[PDB]
Every structure is written in structure tokens, then in C-alpha cells.
Amino acid sequence: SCALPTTYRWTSSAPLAQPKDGWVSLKDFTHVPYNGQHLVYASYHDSTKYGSMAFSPFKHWADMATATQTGMTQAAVAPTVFYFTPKKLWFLVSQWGSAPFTYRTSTDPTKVNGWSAPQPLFTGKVADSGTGPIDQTVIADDRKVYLFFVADNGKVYRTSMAIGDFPANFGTASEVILSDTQAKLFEAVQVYTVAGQNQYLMIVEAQGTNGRYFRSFTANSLDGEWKVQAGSESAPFAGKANSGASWTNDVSHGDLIRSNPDQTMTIDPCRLQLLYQGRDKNKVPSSYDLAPYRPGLLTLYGLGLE
Ligand SMILES: OC[C@@H]1O[C@H](O)[C@H](O)[C@H]1O
Ligand SMILES: [Ca+2]
Numbered sequence: 339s340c341a342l343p344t345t346y347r348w349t350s351s352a353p354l355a356q357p358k359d360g361w362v363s364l365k366d367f368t369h370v371p372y373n374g375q376h377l378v379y380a381s382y383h384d385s386t387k388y389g390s391m392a393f394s395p396f397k398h399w400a401d402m403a404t405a406t407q408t409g410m411t412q413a414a415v416a417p418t419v420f421y422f423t424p425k426k427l428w429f430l431v432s433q434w435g436s437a438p439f440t441y442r443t444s445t446d447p448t449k450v451n452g453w454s455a456p457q458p459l460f461t462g463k464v465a466d467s468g469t470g471p472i473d474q475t476v477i478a479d480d481r482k483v484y485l486f487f488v489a490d491n492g493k494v495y496r497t498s499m500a501i502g503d504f505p506a507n508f509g510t511a512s513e514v515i516l517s518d519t520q521a522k523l524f525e526a527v528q529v530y531t532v533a534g535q536n537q538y539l540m541i542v543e544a545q546g547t548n549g550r551y552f553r554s555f556t557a558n559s560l561d562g563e564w565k566v567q568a569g570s571e572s573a574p575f576a577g578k579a580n581s582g583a584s585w586t587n588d589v590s591h592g593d594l595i596r597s598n599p600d601q602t603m604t605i606d607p608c609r610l611q612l613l614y615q616g617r618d619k620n621k622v623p624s625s626y627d628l629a630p631y632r633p634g635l636l637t638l639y640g641l642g643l644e
Contacts, residue, residue, distance in 0.1 A: 339534030340608035342556075346568055346575055347639045350583035353616070353632035354402040355393070360384055361407070363631040364391075366416045366473075366526070367592040367613045370447070370599035376402070377448060378613070379417045379430065382409070383627055390414040390432065392450045399635055408450040414440075416473050416591070419447055421599045424501060429601075431476050437461050439474045439485070441505050458507040460485055460497070467491040471512075473591065477529045477538075477560060478504070478601040484560045486540075487512075488527045492520040494542060498561065516564055521545040522553070526591035529560070531604040533597060539605070540564055541575050541594070549587035549619075551577025552612075576612055576636055583634060586616030590631070610638040 357364050366381040375395035382391050390413050393405040414432035421428050428447040433439055437458035444453050463470060467489035474487040483504040485497050494516040497508045516523055526543035540555040554575035555564040568575045576589045583589070592614035597606040615631040 341535060342532065342539065342554075342567070342607055342610075343638075344568075345573060346580050348576060348581050348612070348636040349639065350581050350585075350637075351399065351635040353585060353634060354399060355405070355407075355633055356403070357382060357632075358407040362628055363615075364407075364633055365591060365615050365631045367615065367633055368417050368419045369593050369595060369613050370419050370421070371596070372448060372599065377419070378402070378633075379414070379419050380633070381415050381417070382407075385628075388413065388415050388627075390417055392448070395448055402633065411451055412456065414442070414453075414456075418475050419599075420476065420601050420603065421447075422478075422504065422601045424504070429476070429505065431459055431474055432456075433472055433474065437507070438463070438471050439487070443505070457505070459505065460487075460508045460512075462497070462508075462510045462512050464489050464491070464493070464495060464512065466493075471495065473526050475528050475603070476601070477531070477603045479531075479560050482560065483601065484529070485512075486515075486527050486529050488523065488525055488542065490520065490524060492523045493517050494523055494527055494540075494564075496561075516542075516555070522569075526552075528593060529603060530594055530596070531602040532556075533604050533606050535607055538562075539567075539594075543590055544571070544574075546571040546574075546577060548578050550590040551575070551579070552589060576614070581636055583616060583636070585618060586632075586634065587619045588616050589636070590615045590617075592633070612636040 390410045418431040439460040440456035441459040442453040469490040495512040552575040553569040554567040595611040616634045
């Protein structure tokens with residue numbers, strides 16, 4: 339195995355795709371390996387609203403730029419895709435619409451518009467938030483399925499249910515598991531099982547002075563306490579300080595590359611890669627919702643002598 343490093347260093351791709359005509363951005367990526375291919379769902383923004391989409395399955399990252407971009411006719415903003423092995427079904431979890439978070443199911447997750455009708459997955463609210471719950475992820479161990487989310491408010495939230503109950507509405511309850519400034523625990527929480535390392539990894543997007551960046555935390559169990567791993571802007575999990583990305587100062591909402599598509603959200607720490615959203619650092623400010631986000635890929639450096 340390969341331990342997660344003390345100090346992260348990455349190289350970056352160029353932007354991996356441009357939005358198709360009529361869209362301004364591609365955002366909030368979720369990726370699974372599927373039949374030897376990359377399967378990516380994402381949010382998009384057009385001139386006026388958010389929606390969701392998938393890319394046609396593609397073998398190589400080089401392929402992403404020409405993959406077909408298909409909008410979902412019932413939006414599934416900020417999606418999470420995985421296979422739930424105890425039901426033999428694929429899940430797509432997302433925000434807004436009929437409930438704060440919803441789930442939908444499929445036997446073939448590549449059917450962009452083939453998912454079941456959305457059902458409530460979470461019906462809670464939280465305090466001191468202008469957005470409410472956003473940016474969920476879902477992850478399980480052998481005992482429970484957990485929902486983690488954020489709220490643009492400096493807090494990370496968690497709820498859970500017994501594994502044998504999933505899927506169902508988690509309900510209204512949630513607990514604060516991490517609390518800091520709004521900037522430090524802002525958006526885009528993700529949680530993973532670290533293969534061969536007997537631990538769990540969380541990343542959370544923060545607003546830095548130089549751009550968006552990710553902060554990492556580790557825990558010994560999904561119901562355990564999270565402790566910071568790489569939390570400063572100058573020595574982050576991933577950010578301008580260590581991304582190797584020349585084109586973007588932001589390293590923002592996406593997904594680590596998972597080694598298998600199931601509910602454990604497993605990553606291979608020997609092949610650590612981040613599918614992120616970035617934006618041209620030289621494009622003058624405009625509204626956030628019109629920001630020209632694009633996919634990018636970070637790949638961790640190999641070990642070296644220095
Ligand atoms: O893309 C819509 C929202 O903005 C941010 O990318 C956030 O993470 C997501 O909820
Ligand atoms: Ca997400």
C-alpha cells in the first residue's frame with residue numbers, strides 16, 4: 339500500500355472539456371468507473387439556471403473533450419453516483435426538487451434520462467445557513483449508510499441509517515461534526531474509504547485568499563471524529579499552492595477517482611487523482627453563477643528523492 343502523504347503535490351491537466359453550445363459551465367463532478375470507462379455526471383449552468391448532465395462514457399481523459407454532453411430533463415444538481423451492492427442497483431443522489439436531497443435508481447447508470455422518479459433522501463434543515471443543506475455525499479460501511487453535507491456556513495453535518503434500511507429518507511435530523519469559519523468549511527464535502535490504509539478520508543472545499551481549495555481530514559470510522567490532515571491554504575489537500583495548474587487558481591467541487599463504483603467510495607492511495615472544477619484565472623469577475631467552470635484532473639506526484 340501507499341500512505342496518504344504529509345505534504346500533497348500534484349500535476350494538473352488542462353481543462354478537460356468545454357461546455358457545449360448553450361451552456362456556460364460544467365461543475366460539481368461525480369465519477370465512477372463503468373465497463374472500463376469513465377462515467378461522469380455533473381451540474382451545468384446555462385445563461386439562467388443550474389441543471390445536471392452526463393458525458394457519454396469515455397475510455398481516456400483525452401476523450402472527455404469530445405464526449406457527448408446530455409442534459410437531464412429532471413435536474414439532479416450536485417450529483418453523487420454509486421452502485422449499492424446490497425440492492426444490486428445504481429443510485430444518483432442530488433439536491434433540490436422534491437426534497438432537500440433526493441435519490442433515484444437505475445440498472446444502467448449510463449442512461450442519462452433513464453433514472454427512476456426521485457424520492458426523498460433527506461428532509462432536514464439547518465441553522466445559520468443562507469443556502470440550507472447542499473453538496474451531499476453518501477458512503478457506507480458494513481453497518482450503516484451515512485449522508486454528509488455542508489451549508490455554506492462553516493459546518494459539516496452527518497446523519498445515518500442502518501445499512502439494511504437503505505434506500506429510505508434519512509429524515510429530518512442531522513448533527514454538526516466539524517465547525518469552523520464559513521470560509522474554512524464551505525462547500526463540496528466528499529468522503530472516501532482509503533484502500534489498504536484502514537481509514538477514511540474527507541475533503542471539504544474552503545474559500546482561500548488566492549482561490550478555492552480543499553482541506554483534508556481523516557477518521558478511523560464514518561461515525562468517528564474527524565481530525566485535520568492538510569488544512570492550510572499554503573499546504574492544502576489541493577489548491578493553487580500545490581495543484582500544478584497554470585490555468586486556474588481555484589481547485590473546487592469534484593470527486594477523487596474511485597477504484598470501484600460501490601457505496602464504500604473507495605480510493606486507491608497509490609493512484610490518487612482528483613476530478614475538480616477550475617476556471618480561467620484571467621477571466622474578469624462576473625456573477626458566480628456564470629463563472630466558466632471546467633473539469634480538470636490532478637494526479638499526485640510519485641515518490642522521489644528530494
Ligand atoms: O453548482 C451549484 C453549486 O455551486 C458550487 O459549485 C456548489 O458546490 C454547488 O452546490
Ligand atoms: Ca459532490
